Amino acid sequence: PLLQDGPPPGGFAPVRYARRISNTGPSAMAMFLAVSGAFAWGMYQVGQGNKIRR
Amino acid sequence: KDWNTVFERSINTLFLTEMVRGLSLTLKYFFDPKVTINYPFEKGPLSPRFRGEH
Amino acid sequence: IGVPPNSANLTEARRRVFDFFRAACRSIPTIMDIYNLQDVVAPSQLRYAISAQIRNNAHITDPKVIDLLIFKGMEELTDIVDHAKQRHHIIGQYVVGGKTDFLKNFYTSNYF
Amino acid sequence: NFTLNFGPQHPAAHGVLRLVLEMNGEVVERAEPHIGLLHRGTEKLIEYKTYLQALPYFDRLDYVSMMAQEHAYSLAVEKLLNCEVPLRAQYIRVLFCEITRILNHLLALTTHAMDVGALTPFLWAFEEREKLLEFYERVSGARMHASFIRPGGVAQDLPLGLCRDIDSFTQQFASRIDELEEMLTGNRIWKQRLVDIGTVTAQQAKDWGFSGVMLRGSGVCWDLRRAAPYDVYDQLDFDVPVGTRGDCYDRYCIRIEEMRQSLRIIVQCLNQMPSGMIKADDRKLCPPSRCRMKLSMESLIHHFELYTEGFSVPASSTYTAVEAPKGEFGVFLVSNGSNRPYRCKIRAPGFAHLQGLDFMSKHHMLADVVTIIGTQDIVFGEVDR
Amino acid sequence: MRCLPDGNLLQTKIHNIGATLVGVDKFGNKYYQKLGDTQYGRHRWVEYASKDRYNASQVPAEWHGWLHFITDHTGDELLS
Amino acid sequence: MMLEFAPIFIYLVISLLVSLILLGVPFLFSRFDIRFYLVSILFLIFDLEVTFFFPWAVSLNKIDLFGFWSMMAFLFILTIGFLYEWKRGALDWE
Amino acid sequence: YIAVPAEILGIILPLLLGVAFLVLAERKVMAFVQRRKGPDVVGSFGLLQPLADGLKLILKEPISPSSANFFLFRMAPVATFMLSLVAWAVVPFDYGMVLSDLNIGLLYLFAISSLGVYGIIIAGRSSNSKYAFLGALRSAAQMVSYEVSIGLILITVLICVGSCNLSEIVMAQKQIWFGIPLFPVLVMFFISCLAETNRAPFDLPEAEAELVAGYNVEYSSMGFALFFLGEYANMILMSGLCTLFFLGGWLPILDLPIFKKIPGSIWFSIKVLFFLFLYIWVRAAFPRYRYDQLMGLGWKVFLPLSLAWVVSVSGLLVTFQWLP
Amino acid sequence: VRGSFLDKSEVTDRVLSVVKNFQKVDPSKVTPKANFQNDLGLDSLDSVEVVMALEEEFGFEIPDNEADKIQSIDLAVDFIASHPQAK
Amino acid sequence: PVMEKLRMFVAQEPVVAASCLIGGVGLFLPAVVRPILDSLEAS
Amino acid sequence: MDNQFIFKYSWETLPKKWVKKMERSEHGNRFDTNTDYLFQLLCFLKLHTYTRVQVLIDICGVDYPSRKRRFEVVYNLLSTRYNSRIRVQTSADEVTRISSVVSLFPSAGWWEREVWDMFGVSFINHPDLRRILTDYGFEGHPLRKDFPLSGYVQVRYDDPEKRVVSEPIEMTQEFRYFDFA
Amino acid sequence: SKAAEFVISKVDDLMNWARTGSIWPMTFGLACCAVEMMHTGAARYDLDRFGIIFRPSPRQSDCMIVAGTLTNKMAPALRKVYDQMPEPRWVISMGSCANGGGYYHYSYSVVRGCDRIVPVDIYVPGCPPTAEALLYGLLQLQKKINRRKDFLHWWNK
C-alpha cells in the first residue's frame, strides 16, 4: 500500500566507517630492561643453585 | 635517523611485538559465544519469498 | 611462429602443404607410442591416411582455402599429439586399425 | 626447464584452475593458464532466450557478485529501449550493488588469506557474508541468484523492516573490517607474502586491459562510478583509493578501503531512500500487479504477452559497462528488433586479469603464484562463460 | 542415555534448560523457545519425538514456518 | 653403566610391533638443485660444531679459562667460514 | 625385566590416546577462535570423534601404488612413527618417573631428532611422484636447518646444568627455572620446535593450496595415519622438552608447602598443556612463510642468535665462577 | 671393429625395396638409376612420400633443403650411403 | 663519518647486531672482567 | 573530450581511405574500416596526442549469414586519458585472414583466440593462435548461426574402455523452439 | 547361528558408526554451488562438528561432492580423481548443473549430469541448494551408509 520500507524520521544514527586506532602497546626500553634484568638476576640465581647442588 | 627510533625498531622486530596483538584478539573470540546452528534441531532463518520446491 | 599471411598463389600454398605433410608424417612414431598401436596398425597406413586426406582435396584452386585447410590440419595434429583422447579403433576423426546398398539401407530404416 | 602442471580440483584455488608453469628451480619462468574448463556456452544459449529468460545467465557469470551483472545487463537493455527507471529503484539498485561489492571483497580477501595460510579471517568474514545473503533472500527469496534487478527497475519492493536491519548491520561492520585488518595488515608474515609481489606498472595495466583494483593499484585514478556514472552514483559521496606501488599489498589495502567506502555508500542510500514506484511505468515492458491482471483486460493482455513472447528491443547495438567488484564488466548487446538478443558478448575483467598472469608472475617463487592469483580475484564463471 | 553417543541431541538437551514449551505437533515433536539474544534473538528449536532416527523432514508444514522464522505464528495458530 | 639402555631396546621392539599391527590390519578386511647439497654441507659443519660443544659444555668446570678460549678459537675459525658462506649467497634461497 | 613391557605399554598406549585427543583439542580450539563449535556430534561434546576417525582409517582399503619401491613406501611411515614413540623412553614425568635414566639423554634426544628426517625423505622418493619428492626435499631441508639451532640451545642448557641427564636438568632448576634468565632462548626454542615439526607458520606439507604438494600426498589408510600420529606425538614431545628445559619440569612454581601438595606429574602436565595450547593458538593466528623465507630465517636469524647465546652464557658463567 | 657408415650395397637394396613396394611402382621400372617423376609415374606428393619413407627405413631425418635433390634412386643411395646418422 | 653507518647497519640488520652484542658481552667478560676479579682476589 | 569532438577531429585528421563509415550516436561513436587498414587505424588512435586510445576493452565477432562477408569483428576501445570510448569495426569471411593487433595491445591475444574458436576468423602475425574455450579436438565454430545449440557430440564414461569417450548426440527431450513471432 | 548373527550385526553397526562419524569429502568446486558448499563448512553450519573434514587429496577422501557445472573438457579430470578414491567411497551430486545439466542442459559443451561420468549416491536439488540443503543431503548419505551390512554379506559369500 502507501507504506514502504525506509528510514525513520530524522534518518538512521551515524555510523563509523574509518579505522579506529587501538594502542601503542608495551614500551621498548621496558622490554629490553625486563629481559636484561631477568637475565642478570637469573644467572646469579643459577650460580647459587649450582653451588647448592655441588 | 636517530638512536631511539632505531632501537625501538630493533626491539619491535626482535620481540615480535605486532604478533602479540593477533594472538590477543584471537584469544578474545575464544571465550565469546558461538554462531553455529544446531541442525537439524535448529534452523536458519528464511523469508516468505523463499524459492524452494515447486 | 606467428600466423603467416595468406599464400599469394598456388606455388607457395603447395610448399606449405608439403611442409605440413612432412610435419604430420614425422609425428607418426609419437602417435604410435601414445596410442599403443604396435599390434593394431602399421605406420605406413597412418602415412597413407594423411596423404589420402591431402589427395581428396587436390581439386582446390583457391590458395586461401588451402591455407585454412593447412591451419586446421595443424590444429588437429596438435590436439592428436598433445591432448590425445584414446578410443580403440579411432584416432581423432580416423578409424585406425550379394545385395545392393539400397536393400541394406531399407532393412535398416526409412531414413537413408 | 621442468614443467609443473598445477590443477587444483577444489575451491581452495578456484577449482577449475589449471596452470602449466615452466620453472628454473623454485623460480617461475612462464605461467600458462589453461581455461575453458567452465565454458558452458552462455553466449550461445542467450541467443535462444527472450530478454527476460536471459537475465538469470548473468547471475551465474561472476557468481560471487550476482546483482552487479544483473545490473549491467538491465542497464544495457534500458539503454537500447530508452527506458526511464524510477528513483527509488535506482537507489535500491545502488544499495544492492554496494552490498554485493562487500560480499565479493570479503570472499576474495579471506580466500586469498586462507591460501597463504591465515585460516581464521575466512570464518570471521563468512559470518558477515551470511548476514548479507539474508538481505538477498529477504528481497528475492534466493540467497545468491536473486534475478532481482531487471530492465526497468527491480522485481519487487523491499519488505517492511529490511532497511532497519541493514542499518543495524552497518552500525557494526566497521569493527569487523578492523578485526580483519589487525589480523592481516600489520603482520610481518603477511607483508612478507605480499609486498613487492606481482608489481604492475600503469602502462602494463593499460596494455593488458586491466580494470578495477588491478588498475587502481598502479596509481591510475579510474572508477566507472565516477568516470561514467549510472543510477544515483553522482548523488553519493565516496572516495576512490589508488595505490602507489602497484603490488599485491597495495591491492589488498585498496580492497579493504573499498569495503569501507561501500559501507559509506550503503549508509547514504539508506538515509536518502525515497518513496514511490520500483518499476518503470511504461505498460509495454513491465509486469502489471497481480490484482490488476486479475481485474483489468489490458493488464491481463500485457501479462500474457510479457510472459510468453517478451518485449521487443529496436534494432541497434551498444556496449555498456559498470564498475563490478572485479573490475569493468561489459555487455556488447546486438538487437535485431525481435524479442531475443541477436548477439550478447560478455566482457569479463577476469579474462584480462588472468591473461596477465604470465607477465605478473615472471621471476617469482612458486608460492607467489597463488598470491598473484588471489590478488587478481579470478572467478571462472566469468572467465569461461 | 542417548546423550552419550549422540552429541547432537546433547546440545539440544543442554540448551532446553530454561526454555519455554511452545507446542507439540501430531508426531509428538516438541517446540521450544527462549526469548533471549544470542544468535540475534533466534531461539527456536524442535526436539524430535524419535530420539534416534530423527530427520529434518519430520517437521510438519504448520510448524515449518515457525521453525525457520518465516512466520511468528505457531503450528497451533496456523491449524486454527 | 649401560644398564639403562636395555629398556630402550625392548621399547623399540614393542613400538615396532605396534607399527606392524596398525599397518597390517587393513590388509585383512631429473632436476638437480645444488642448494640442497649446500644446505647439507652447512648442516654437516654445524652438526660437528654441536658434537664438539657437548664435551666442552660438560667439562667447563674443569678446563677453566684455557678450555674456554680454545673453544672460542675453534668457533672463530668456523664463524669465519660461516661469514664466507653468508657473503657468497649460500644462505639465500631466492 | 619381565615387568618392563608393562611399563612400556603404560607409556605407549596413553600416549596414543593423548595424540588422538590432541587432534580433537586442536579442532576444538581452532573452532572456538573461529566462533564455531568443532566436533560435537560424534559422542558427547565430540569426545568419540577420534575413535570414529581411527576406525574409519583402519577400515579403509590401502592403495599401495604400482611403484618400484614397494617395501620403502610402506616402511617410511613406520620409521617416523617408531622414532616419534621412542623418544619418550627418557622423558621424566616426575622424580623417578622415567623408563630409562640415561646419563647421555640430551644427546640421545638430539640423535632421535636427527633421525626423524629419513621417513619424510623416503616417503617422498619412494612414492614415484615428482611433487611428493620436491615437497619432501624441502621439508627435510627445513628440518635439518632448524636442528642446528635446536642443538645450540641444548648446549646452552647443558652449560648451565653440567650433565646430559634430563632428570638432573630438571633438578638443576630448583633455585630458578631456566626460562626466566634465558627467556629469549626459550622463545627461540619454541619457534625452532614449530619449524622442526613442520607446524604453522612453517607447515609446508599443509600448503597444497599454495601449489606445494606434501610428502605424504600419495599415502592412504594407516600409512597416512602413522605419519599424522608421529607428527602429533612429536608436538607433544616438543612441548614436554620446552617444559623440561625451561619451566622446571615437574617442579612447582614456588617452593612452598601449598604448591608441594599437588603431585609433580600434574605440574609437568599443566606446563605441557600450556605449550600445546600455544601450538594451536599460533596455528590459529598467523599466515605461513614461503620456503625461501623460512630457510633464510633458519640460517640468518636463529643460528647466529643461538651461537651468541652459547658464547654469552658460557662466558658469564666462567667469569664469575658460577659453573655447575 | 666398429664403423660409422652403412654399406653401399645394403643401402642400395634397402632403397630399391622401399621404392619397389611403395604403392604405384611396378617392380619393373625400378632400376638403380630410375628417376621418380620422369620414369616412375610419381607426382611431387608421391615423391615426397617416397623420400619420407626413406627416412623411416634408415631411422633418421633428411633435411628439407637436401631432399629437393634426391630425385632418383642413385641420388638417394648417394645421400644415405655416406650419412653417419644412417642406421 | 662512521657513526651513522653503524646506525644504518643496526637499523637494517637488527639480528646480526644483537648477536654481535650478545656474543661480544660473552667474550668481553672473561677477557676483561675475569682478570680484574682475579687481581682483586690476590690482594 | 566528447563524442562531437572525436567525430569532427577524426574526420579532419584521419587519412580518408581508412574509414568507409562513421556513425555518431548515443549508442557509441563507430568507425568502419577495410581489413587492410585496421592495424594502422588502431595504431594511430593509440599513439596520437588528441586521441590516446590506450585500452583495448575487447574484440568480438558477430555472424551475419545473409552477407557475403558474414563476420563482423568489433573492437571496443577506451581512452582513460580523455574519458572516452570508441568502437571500430571491420568485416570478414570464412577464409580471409585479418591482421592481429597483439603488438599494439597485448590484451588482444586471448580475445583473438576466442574469435578464432567461436567464429573461425584467423589473425595474421598472432604468436599463438589456437582454440582457448572449447574442448580439445572440437570441430566447428559454435557461435556461428548455423552451428546447432546442442552441437554434434556428447561425452560419457565407457566402462569397457575404462575412459570418458565422445559419441554423436542423443537427446532424451529435444530443445523446444517456441516461435512467438 | 543364534549367536553369530548378533555379533555380526554388532560388528556392522560399529563399522557403520565409524564410517558415518568420519566422512572426509573431497570437494570438486566447479561453479557457484562451491560457494554454498563453502558456507556449509563455515561457522554457521560447521561441517566439522559432524566429523566432516575436507581433504585435498582423493587418497585421504571417502566422499566426492560435485558442486557445479561439469563441462566435456573437465569430465576426464573428474573421472580420474574419482578413480583415485580408495573404497568405500560415495559421490554427492550438488545442484541442478551437476544433477542433470541445469540451465546449461542444452549446451554443446556441458555434460548433462555428472552421473554420466561417475555413480552418484545422493542428489541435492537447487540452483544453488542452500547450505542447509547440502547438510540435509549429507545426513541422507549417513542414512544410506547405515544400511550397509558389509561383514554379514562377506560372511555369507
Ligand SMILES: CCCCCCCCCCCCCCCCCC(=O)O[C@@H](COC(=O)CCCCCCCCCCCCCCC)COP(=O)(O)OC[C@H](O)CO
Ligand atoms: C665466535 C667467537 C669468536 C671469538 C674470537 C676471539 C677469541 C679467539 C681466541 C683467541 C686466543 C685467546 C684470546 C683471549 C685472551 C685471554 C687469554 C687468557 O685469559 O689467558 C688464559 C690462558 O688462555 C690460553 O692460554 C688459551 C689460548 C687459546 C688457544 C688459542 C690458539 C692460539 C694459537 C694456538 C697455536 C696452535 C696452532 C693452531 C692450529 C690451528 C689464562 O689462563 P691460566 O693460565 O690462568 O690457566 C689456564 C686455565 O684457566 C686452566 O685450564
Ligand SMILES: CCCCCCCCCCCCCCCCCCCC(=O)O[C@H](COC(=O)CCCCCCCCCCCCCC)COP(=O)(O)OCCN
Ligand atoms: C611464560 C610464557 C612463555 C612463552 C614461551 C614461548 C613464547 C611464544 C613463542 C611464539 C610466539 C609466536 C611465534 C610465531 C612467530 C614466528 C615468526 C618469527 C619470525 C622471526 O623470528 O623474526 C625475527 C625476529 O624474531 C626473533 O628473532 C625471535 C628470537 C628473539 C630472541 C631475542 C634476542 C634478543 C633479546 C634481547 C636479549 C638482551 C638481554 C640479554 C643481554 C626477525 O626476522 P624477520 O624477517 O621477521 O624481521 C622482521 C621484523 N619486523
Ligand SMILES: CCCCCCCCCCCC(=O)SCCNC(=O)CCNC(=O)[C@H](O)C(C)(C)COP(=O)(O)O
Ligand atoms: C593422424 C593424422 C593427424 C593429422 C591429420 C591432418 C589431416 C589434414 C586434412 C586436410 C589436408 C589437406 O587437404 S591440405 C590441402 C591440400 N590441397 C591441395 O594441395 C590442393 C592443390 N593441389 C595440389 O597441390 C595437387 O593436386 C597435389 C596432388 C595435392 C600435389 O601436387 P602434385 O599433383 O604436383 O603432386
Ligand code: SF4
Ligand atoms: S546448479 Fe545453479 S548455482 Fe549450482 S553451479 Fe549450476 S548454475 Fe551455479
